Amino acid sequence: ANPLYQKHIISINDLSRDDLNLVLATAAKLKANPQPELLKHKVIASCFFEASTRTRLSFETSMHRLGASVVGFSDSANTSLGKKGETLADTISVISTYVDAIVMRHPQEGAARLATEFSGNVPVLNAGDGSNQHPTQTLLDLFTIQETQGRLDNLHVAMVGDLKYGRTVHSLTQALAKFDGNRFYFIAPDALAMPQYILDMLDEKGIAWSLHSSIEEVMAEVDILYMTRVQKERLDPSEYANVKAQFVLRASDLHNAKANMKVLHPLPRVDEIATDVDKTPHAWYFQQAGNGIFARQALLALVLNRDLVL
Amino acid sequence: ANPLYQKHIISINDLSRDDLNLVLATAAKLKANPQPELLKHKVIASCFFEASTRTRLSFETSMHRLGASVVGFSDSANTSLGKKGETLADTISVISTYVDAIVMRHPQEGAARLATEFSGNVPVLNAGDGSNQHPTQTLLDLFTIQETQGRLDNLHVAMVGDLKYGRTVHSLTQALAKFDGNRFYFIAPDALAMPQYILDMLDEKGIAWSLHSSIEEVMAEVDILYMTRVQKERLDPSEYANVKAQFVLRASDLHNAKANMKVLHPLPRVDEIATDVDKTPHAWYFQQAGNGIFARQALLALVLNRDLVL
Amino acid sequence: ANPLYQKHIISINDLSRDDLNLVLATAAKLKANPQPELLKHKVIASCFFEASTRTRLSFETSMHRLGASVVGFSDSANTSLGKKGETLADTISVISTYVDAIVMRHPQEGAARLATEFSGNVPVLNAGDGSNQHPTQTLLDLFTIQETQGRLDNLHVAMVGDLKYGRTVHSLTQALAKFDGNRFYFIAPDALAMPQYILDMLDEKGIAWSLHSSIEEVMAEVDILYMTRVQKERLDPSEYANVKAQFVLRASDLHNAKANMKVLHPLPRVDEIATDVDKTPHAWYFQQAGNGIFARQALLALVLNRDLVL
Amino acid sequence: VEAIKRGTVIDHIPAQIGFKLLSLFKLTETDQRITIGLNLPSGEMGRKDLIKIENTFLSEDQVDQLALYAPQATVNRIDNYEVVGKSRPSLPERIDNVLVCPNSNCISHAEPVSSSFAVRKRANDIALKCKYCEKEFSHNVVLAN
Amino acid sequence: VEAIKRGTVIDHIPAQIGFKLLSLFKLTETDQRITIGLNLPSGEMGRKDLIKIENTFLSEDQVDQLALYAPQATVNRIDNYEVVGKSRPSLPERIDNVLVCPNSNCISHAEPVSSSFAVRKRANDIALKCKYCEKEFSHNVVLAN
Numbered sequence A, B, C: 001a002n003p004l005y006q007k008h009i010i011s012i013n014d015l016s017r018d019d020l021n022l023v024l025a026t027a028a029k030l031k032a033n034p035q036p037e038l039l040k041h042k043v044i045a046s047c048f049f050e051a052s053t054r055t056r057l058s059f060e061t062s063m064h065r066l067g068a069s070v071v072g073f074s075d076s077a078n079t080s081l082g083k084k085g086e087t088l089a090d091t092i093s094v095i096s097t098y099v100d101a102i103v104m105r106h107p108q109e110g111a112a113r114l115a116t117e118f119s120g121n122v123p124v125l126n127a128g129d130g131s132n133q134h135p136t137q138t139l140l141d142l143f144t145i146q147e148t149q150g151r152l153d154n155l156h157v158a159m160v161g162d163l164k165y166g167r168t169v170h171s172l173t174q175a176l177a178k179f180d181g182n183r184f185y186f187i188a189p190d191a192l193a194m195p196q197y198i199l200d201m202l203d204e205k206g207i208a209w210s211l212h213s214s215i216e217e218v219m220a221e222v223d224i225l226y227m228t229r230v231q232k233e234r235l236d237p238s239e240y241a242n243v244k245a246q247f248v249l250r251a252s253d254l255h256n257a258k259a260n261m262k263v264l265h266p267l268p269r270v271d272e273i274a275t276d277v278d279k280t281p282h283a284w285y286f287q288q289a290g291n292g293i294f295a296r297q298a299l300l301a302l303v304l305n306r307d308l309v310l
Numbered sequence D, E: 001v002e003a004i005k006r007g008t009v010i011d012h013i014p015a016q017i018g019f020k021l022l023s024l025f026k027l028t029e030t031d032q033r034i035t036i037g038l039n040l041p042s043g044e045m046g047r048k049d050l051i052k053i054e055n056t057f058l059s060e061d062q063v064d065q066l067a068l069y070a071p072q073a074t075v076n077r078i079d080n081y082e083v084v085g086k087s088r089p090s091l092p093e094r095i096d097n098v099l100v101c102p103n104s105n106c107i108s109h110a111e112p113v114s115s116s117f118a119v120r121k122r123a124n125d126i127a128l129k130c131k132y133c134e135k136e137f138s139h140n141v142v143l144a145n
């Protein structure tokens, strides 16, 4: 059995560099040579208690590409937990007797971790738990970086926007920090700064990072420009002064960028990325989203198949 | 005809040191010898389009105290302006054909000024217009400051709280600045700071003012500690970080306080003034509120009666 | 100084048979010979934080009937307590610096008592505090009971309806229990039964009382049939089974009724009293309501005027 | 050895009660020395608690406040290592601050006032009538904050 | 100086921490003789609290769960009136059940699960990382249940 067989995928913090590489390598192979019957006879639950377009749809699509069935809900309002007052615990207890794997996104941090404590032998894949982790986003992000840059080492990465509530960058920073020589640039408002527990992690590994108040300040050095949306759903009203994007990226701001730099964004974007960036050779958020398919198929295959020989 | 006969009372900026002095003197005379019939045969409008406890009630009590009748509303919701789409202008145009004077508080800045342009010969008295002016508050404030300090000049005054939206401190700062030698200390979050048009006016008269981050800092030299409430209802969501009072005066902060020092508050108070302050000798906000009677009787007397208080 | 001069009127429990008798006598004198100027120069607050038709209007009519002026509100929604987060205490602290007396009705039990601790020398008159006391109701009730029965002792009294939340029957039962030989019949669902602290007080004086499941049962021996409305607004949802009146008095239930028997109701009535009862000789709730004038003129006269009704 | 030089000693406190008294009237929120004996032998009471507070004294009213929990207790006023006063708690006419009115619609929960209940020996137990409420409950059900 | 045949003695408890220990550890729940000394004079610590429970002993990690509250406290296992074991509370790997995650959006608040943090001494204070939300906080912030 492979390393990830029957493993819960809750936080990048529980995965090793090898685990990541495994997912990425499998993603590359599935992208090149599809396996429509890989997960035949499997039934997976797609449970989203929080809004979503890319994550849910790509996951379910990935399930069908592998030949599995999908059961679930995109809203808890009509589940028994939403109308009859059932606990998340009890919910996971019964759904885990129906399916082979549970993909879940929840508004509270730790919801995916808790699930694993009630799913028995059913693997839980965290599609996002509050502003904590977003493992499959990182998987697809790393996959996208890897093929546009041919490396996951010695990169110059800049993350912009809401770094405090961005579960996207929390997971992406931890993962990249498992690779050697990467340098980070955090461009975010004071109130939505990159969490300290992430920084202490970077210092622990002797990884260089630094803060900046403008994008122009680093434009010429980055290989990856990772933009993020202000997570207004998670903001405390005492932070409502930050709803509007502080950094707006326009085609004109890319004049001195490395030719190979790619602009990434987990999406949705509100106004932090102007649409005139969409036509530049740097715009890579859609290709990025598209890679969500191969990365999630890879994860679903590794977790539900003892061995894969492609 | 006294200086204020048939005159609009809209902004302290329009009044002179003499006008202010005239009100205080009159208030003193009427407190000493009430004139129950002084305004008999007068019908005055009390129109509050915004919440109020002290201002409307003290004003109406004063009208009755002087023998006048009152008509009006304390909620625009049942006026034709509230249910039929009527302009404030037409509302004043018609009410000014019924009453001898109009007292009005309104949520928008400049409402009172607006009314004067449609009232004709009927004097408009500003009971508060948004976060702009609150002329009758300053009047009672001045009456109180002199009652407890013996004078209105050469005082050290600290104004704490929301100085940006406090129509109270706007009028009062302008009034106190018409007197000589006053020292101003402004204690407020940078987001709710005293407007520039007030500071400029101060610089103009070579008046001394300075910003401070705490009450302790100035507690030793202040004669009047003017506390204010954060005007939450006027804040923009991008300022919601300041909803909670930054400065809370507790009884234990009054040790370095001078024996003459008095704590004032236009009220209502949320938590900026602990209740343990209530029993100290420095607490004077309720005495202050009661002074609203005399000041408002005074102003009414001066505006609606031709001769000085005989 | 009459026994009630400058006195708070909060609970019948605080009053004695003599106090009650003094109000009724005064009411009789004033009904016979009105004193239009008796309270000239007085300003009284009418503060209703809870709905009211008879209590507030009869009270204000009485104030004017005696020559006094009135200020106040019939809805806390536009006071600073309703829109700025102000305590009831501070509200009373400031209003007590404007008026000669405060009349207040409030949704929470003990509000009136609370007010007395912040009003200073200004007497607080309880117009109803939650489901607790309603002192001025008992006063008008007693005036009516004597007007129609010739006495206040040795009567058979039936109280029907919501006796648990009826502040009306709480005060009245305590008042009638200060007189001798009264028989009490309580007709009410077990969920809305007369509180224990009332029964205990009755047992204490060896007063005779008994529970009954129907009106018919006691219609033959009752002198006063006191009907009440289910206090829906005070019920807990776990008591919503009792929202609909269990006892409905119809004209055809008045056959065994004694010629002297009168039906009273503090009002308003929902369906506990059919309209066919209105034209019978036993119906006396509107006459009762009108008596609110005399009782309230009386109390006001006694509290605000030093000498007895000359 | 154990003997305070000056202060108060609450002896003959029922079992499991001494701790209650400590958190109720928060007698431990002080800089003064306090020695506490729990589950101690007595015989005339089986086992009892004991609280001793130095340089701290209790007025009669304060002692009566204990009546509700430790009725057969004995408050020894101590000075100069000697017991200069001995009093026993007698039912107080009212209890303030410590308790919370059970009536959820009581104005006391929302406003800046101290709780207050009239104390009445009803029969099998004691009845508490709120000063604000006028509603009365059995001491058993009336909670403390 | 007191004396007990068998049991445990927690000494060198910071002032104003003893009473808390008795509380959130339900130590007074037993019916075994207990002796508490609050604000007692201490040679090198100034003042201190001291607890004695005869016939009772603590957990090797509860002694560590004690390392958070009274880092310089000392538990003494006693038998036959003698200190057969002197211990010192050392920082444990994790704390379970007693702490409450300061993050209001942590699932641990809404569901039937026991709290759990990972202990890790930081620069000056101690850092607590929630097992659920994975957030980290200064032990000062977490100690406010």
Ligand SMILES: NC(=O)[C@H](CC(=O)O)NC(=O)CP(=O)(O)O
Binding pocket: A051, A052, A053, A054, A055, A056, A128, A134, A137, A166, A167, A168, A228, A229, A266, A267, A268
């Ligand atoms: N954390 C997220 O949900 C990230 C970042 C963001 O929402 O701004 N977005 C996504 O996963 C895309 P989705 O909400 O369409 O599934």
Ligand SMILES: NC(=O)[C@H](CC(=O)O)NC(=O)CP(=O)(O)O
Binding pocket: B051, B052, B053, B054, B055, B056, B128, B134, B137, B167, B168, B228, B229, B266, B267, B268, C080, C084
């Ligand atoms: N601007 C005001 O209305 C000031 C300050 C404040 O509201 O905090 N307050 C008053 O005038 C008292 P009111 O609103 O009870 O009439």
Ligand SMILES: NC(=O)[C@H](CC(=O)O)NC(=O)CP(=O)(O)O
Binding pocket: C051, C052, C053, C054, C055, C056, C128, C134, C137, C167, C168, C228, C229, C266, C267, C268
């Ligand atoms: N308790 C009361 O207010 C009683 C009984 C009831 O409301 O049913 N009614 C009155 O006092 C008449 P009001 O509410 O019209 O002033």
Ligand SMILES: [Zn+2]
Binding pocket: C110, D101, D102, D103, D106, D107, D108, D130, D131, D132, D133, D134, D135
């Ligand atoms: Zn109560």
Ligand SMILES: [Zn+2]
Binding pocket: A110, E101, E102, E103, E106, E107, E108, E130, E131, E132, E133, E134, E135
């Ligand atoms: Zn947590």
